[PDB]
Design a binder for this molecule. Structure first.
Ligand SMILES: CCCCCCCCCCCCC/C=C/[C@H](O)[C@H](N)CO
Ligand SMILES: CCCCCCCCCCCCC/C=C/[C@H](O)[C@H](N)CO
Lengths: 249, 42, 249
C-alpha cells in the first residue's frame, strides 16, 4: 500500500592510413601470473657466531615482504592483492659456503608462541607448520596459501587498526593492517649447543594464483621503512632523468 | 518539477480536491459592493 | 541477491443460570451521531450599551468551544474528533427581549482580517462567510464543515506548536494546537451609529457526521480555563460522593 519499498585496412585508423597487420602477439606474459610468479628476495635472516643480531642461534623474522625494493615495488603497484605464495629459503654461510648444518624453519602464525630461545618448547611444532632441512639439501620450498582474514592482502591501509584517540605515540599504527602481518617466520639451528657455522637464511617468495585489484602509481621515491610509504623529503628526486632544455633531447 | 528531479520521493496518494479554488468557489461569496445612505437631515 | 530488502439458555453464562432473553434493545442512541448531535452552548457574546466589554458594537469571538463545561466535557471524552457542525446563534437582549436589530455574523478564518471596528472594511465579507439576520428572525443556523488541516479536531495537544526553547513566557503555547483555532466569529450591529439595544449573541453548536477516536478519562475536576486541563490543586474533589464508612452505604 506504499509502493516505495590486430591492425586492419585511437586504433591507428583515425590518425594515419594503415595496412592490415596480423597481430599474433600473445598477452600471456603481462598477466599477474606471469609478472608476479617470479621468486624475489623478501627476507634475509642472519644467524652469526659473534654478532649481536641473533647470537643465540634463533631468529624471529616478522613476515613483511616490504623489506626489499624490487618485490615491494612490484607488489605495491596494487593495493589489494590475493595470491598463494611459493616460499623458498636458501640457507648459506655469509661467505656462501654450504655447511653441514641442520635448520628448523617454523611458520609461527599470529597467536602462536614466538620462540624465546633456540631450545624453546615452541619448536616442538605440534600444530605450527615447520620445515626441517639441511643446508646441503636444496633450498626448502613450501606452498603458502592465501591466509589473510581479508579477501586480499593490502600493502596500503589508509587508516588505523584500533579505535580511540590516535596520538603521536600511536602514530606508528597508521598503515599497519593486521590482515597483512601473519606472524613470524622462525629459524633455529636444531640443537642444544651453539651451531659452529655462521648462517644466512635468504627468503625467496614467488606468488601463484595471483589476483590484484586496484592499480596505484608506482614507487618513484627511494623506500626507507617497511610497510611505510615514507620518502626522503629533502631529497625528492623526479620520476625520471632530466634535460638541459625542452627543445633538445 | 514534480518533486522527482530534485529529491527522492515516496508515493503519496493526493486525495486533495481542487474544487475550492474554482471561480465558482472563489467568487460565489457575497461581498459588500454598495452602501446607500437615506438620512433624515443629511 | 540479498533477500533481506441477547441472553440465551462474562455474558451471564459462567456466573449464573440464565433464561433466554430476546434483547430487542437498540444501540442507536449511544452512537456519536446520537450523543453529540445535540446543540449546546459553546459561546456567548455581549454587546452592551455602556459596558467596557464590546462598547463599539462589534465583537471578535475566538472559536473555542471549551468555554462551557457541559459541551467541553462531552467533546473532551475523546482527543481526536472529526465532525461537521451545525452552528446556531440565538441573539437577544440581556433581558431576553427580541428587539428589531440587524446583526452581521461573520466567520473570519485564520489569516482573514479581524474587524477593528463596527464600520470596518472587513465587514464587506467578499470572501468570508457571513450571515445577515434580524433578532426578530429565528436564530441563524449554518452548517460548518470539518475545516481542520488535521484529520480530526484535537482537544488535547500534548506538545508545542513552534520549535525553539520553550521558556516560562512561552509556556502558554503548550496544548494550543493551531489545527483547532479556526479564526474568530465576528459579530456587529450593521450600521454607522451605535445600536440602541444591548445585545447578547448565544452560540449553540450541534455536531453532525461525528467521528471520534481515542477515549480518555472524563473531566472529574472543575474546568477553569479554555483549552487548558488546569484544575484547582488545593481543592481537588473526588470523582463522586463519599461515605462515612466502607461497610455501610
Ligand atoms: C614455512 C614458512 C611459511 C611462510 C609464510 C609466509 C606468509 C606469507 C604472507 C605474505 C603476505 C604479505 C605479508 C605482509 C605484507 C607487507 O609486507 C606489509 N604488511 C604491508 O605493507
Ligand atoms: C458563520 C459562523 C461559522 C462558525 C465556524 C465555527 C468553526 C467550528 C470549529 C470547531 C472546532 C473546534 C474549535 C476549537 C476547539 C477547542 O475549543 C480548543 N481549541 C481545544 O481545546
Amino acid at each position: 500500500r506504499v509502493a516505495d519499498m590486430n591492425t586492419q585496412v585511437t586504433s591507428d585508423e583515425s590518425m594515419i592510413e594503415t595496412r592490415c597487420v596480423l597481430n599474433s602477439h600473445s598477452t600471456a606474459e603481462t598477466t599477474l601470473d606471469s609478472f608476479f610468479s617470479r621468486a624475489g628476495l623478501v627476507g634475509e635472516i642472519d644467524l652469526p657466531l659473534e654478532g649481536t643480531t641473533n647470537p643465540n642461534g634463533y631468529a624471529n623474522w616478522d613476515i613483511d615482504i616490504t623489506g626489499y625494493a624490487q618485490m615491494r615495488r612490484k607488489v605495491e603497484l596494487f593495493t589489494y592483492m590475493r595470491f598463494d605464495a611459493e616460499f623458498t629459503f636458501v640457507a648459506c654461510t655469509p661467505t656462501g659456503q654450504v655447511v653441514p648444518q641442520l635448520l628448523q624453519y617454523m611458520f609461527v602464525p599470529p597467536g602462536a608462541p614466538k620462540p624465546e630461545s633456540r631450545e624453546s618448547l615452541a619448536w616442538q611444532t605440534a600444530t605450527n607448520p615447520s620445515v626441517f632441512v639441511k643446508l646441503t639439501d636444496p633450498p626448502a620450498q613450501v606452498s603458502v596459501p592465501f591466509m589473510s582474514p581479508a579477501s586480499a592482502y593490502q600493502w596500503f591501509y589508509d587508516g588505523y587498526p584500533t579505535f580511540g584517540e590516535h596520538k603521536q605515540e600511536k602514530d606508528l599504527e597508521y598503515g599497519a593492517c593486521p590482515n597483512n602481518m601473519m606472524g613470524t617466520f622462525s629459524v633455529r639451528t636444531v640443537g642444544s649447543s651453539k651451531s659452529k657455522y655462521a648462517l644466512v637464511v635468504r627468503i625467496y617468495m614467488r606468488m601463484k594464483h595471483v589476483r590484484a585489484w586496484i592499480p596505484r602509481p608506482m614507487r618513484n621515491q627511494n623506500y626507507l621503512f617497511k610497510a611505510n610509504p615514507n620518502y626522503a623529503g629533502d631529497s625528492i628526486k623526479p620520476t625520471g632523468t632530466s634535460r638541459n632544455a625542452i627543445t633538445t633531447l
